[PDB]
Amino acid sequence: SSHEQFRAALQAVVDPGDPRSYLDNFIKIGEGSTGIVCIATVRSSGKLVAVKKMDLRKQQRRELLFNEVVIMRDYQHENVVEMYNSYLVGDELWVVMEFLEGGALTDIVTHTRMNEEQIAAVCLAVLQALSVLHAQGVIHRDIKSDSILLTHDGRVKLSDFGFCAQVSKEVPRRKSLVGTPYWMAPELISRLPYGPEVDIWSLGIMVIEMVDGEPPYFNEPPLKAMKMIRDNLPPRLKNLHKVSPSLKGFLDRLLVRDPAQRATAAELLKHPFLAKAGPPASIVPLMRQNRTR
Ligand SMILES: CNC(=O)c1cncc2[nH]nc(C(C)C)c12
Numbered sequence: 001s002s003h004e005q006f007r008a009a010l011q012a013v014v015d016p017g018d019p020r021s022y023l024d025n026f027i028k029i030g031e032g033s034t035g036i037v038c039i040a041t042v043r044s045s046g047k048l049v050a051v052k053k054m055d056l057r058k059q060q061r062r063e064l065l066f067n068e069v070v071i072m073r074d075y076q077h078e079n080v081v082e083m084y085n086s087y088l089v090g091d092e093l094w095v096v097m098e099f100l101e102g103g104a105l106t107d108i109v110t111h112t113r114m115n116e117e118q119i120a121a122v123c124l125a126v127l128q129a130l131s132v133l134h135a136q137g138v139i140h141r142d143i144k145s146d147s148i149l150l151t152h153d154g155r156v157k158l159s160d161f162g163f164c165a166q167v168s169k170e171v172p173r174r175k176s177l178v179g180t181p182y183w184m185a186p187e188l189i190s191r192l193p194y195g196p197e198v199d200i201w202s203l204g205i206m207v208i209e210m211v212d213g214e215p216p217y218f219n220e221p222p223l224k225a226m227k228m229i230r231d232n233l234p235p236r237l238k239n240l241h242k243v244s245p246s247l248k249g250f251l252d253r254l255l256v257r258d259p260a261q262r263a264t265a266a267e268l269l270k271h272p273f274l275a276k277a278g279p280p281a282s283i284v285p286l287m288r289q290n291r292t293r
Pocket residue numbers: 029030031032037050052081097098099100101103104146149159160
């Protein structure tokens with residue numbers, strides 16, 4: 001009933017019709033917090049696309065599903081996953097989007113050791129995406145390795161906008177407790193009204209993923225890790241001796257407890273650490289299909 005009501009709402013904003021009419025060979029390739037991801041073949045072309053399928057009845061905040069169509073309509077960009085169409089299919093929202101065949105950054109940080117050229121490439125690409133989003137008041141709010149996808153040729157794109165929000169003159173700060181515990185900014189855990197700064201903190205934690213292979217406190221259960229992030233000084237690299245002074249200096253601009261003193265995306269784009277960034281090709285050897293070839 002509220003379900004039926006919500007379906008009818010989603011229909012108002014999505015494309016008409018049914019992509020099963022033009023896609024074949026759905027194969028499940030992963031699951032996130034809002035739904036599953038399949039690849040599919042476009043029948044006419046043989047081209048591959050990704051289809052995110054999000055059940056309207058299995059969301060913590062089902063109104064956040066509108067984030068998909070806000071981003072799709074308004075905030076497309078070369079470092080954001082291309083989103084082609086959205087549909088209401090039975091009790092699910094489907095988004096047909098680009099297939100990022102280089103996979104998620106998670107697989108790389110789990111199995112591989114990135115060098116600083118590679119790390120600098122990912123950070124530069126993400127910061128390009130964030131500078132543009134933040135300038136328009138869009139906060140991603142779930143920055144972590146799982147949200148960073150790669151093309152086959154090593155180009156970096158943000159994905160998983162399901163938890164994003166907008167700030168504006170009339171709504172200058174957000175308050176919602178949103179994100180993934182280990183990556184959450186301390187002001188957000190503290191329930192202080194917050195802005196785009198929270199994404200810069202989360203990026204800092206992703207740098208720690210890239211250097212150490214996991215976020216701080218990853219062995220603690222989530223409710224307990226958030227307490228630690230809230231209460232303690234900024235987390236430290238397990239492997240400080242393994243990072244250049246340039247990278248440590250960069251990281252120290254991200255993991256600042258006071259949001260007003262944290263570097264902004266625009267400022268971070270000028271950091272000397274990012275001069276180390278290799279081209280997309282530098283990332284390609286880390287990918288599953290290449291690293292044991
Ligand atoms: C883990 N996340 C996803 O699987 C995903 C999410 N949104 C868009 C996508 N395009 N291509 C993929 C996979 C190939 C990584 C995705």
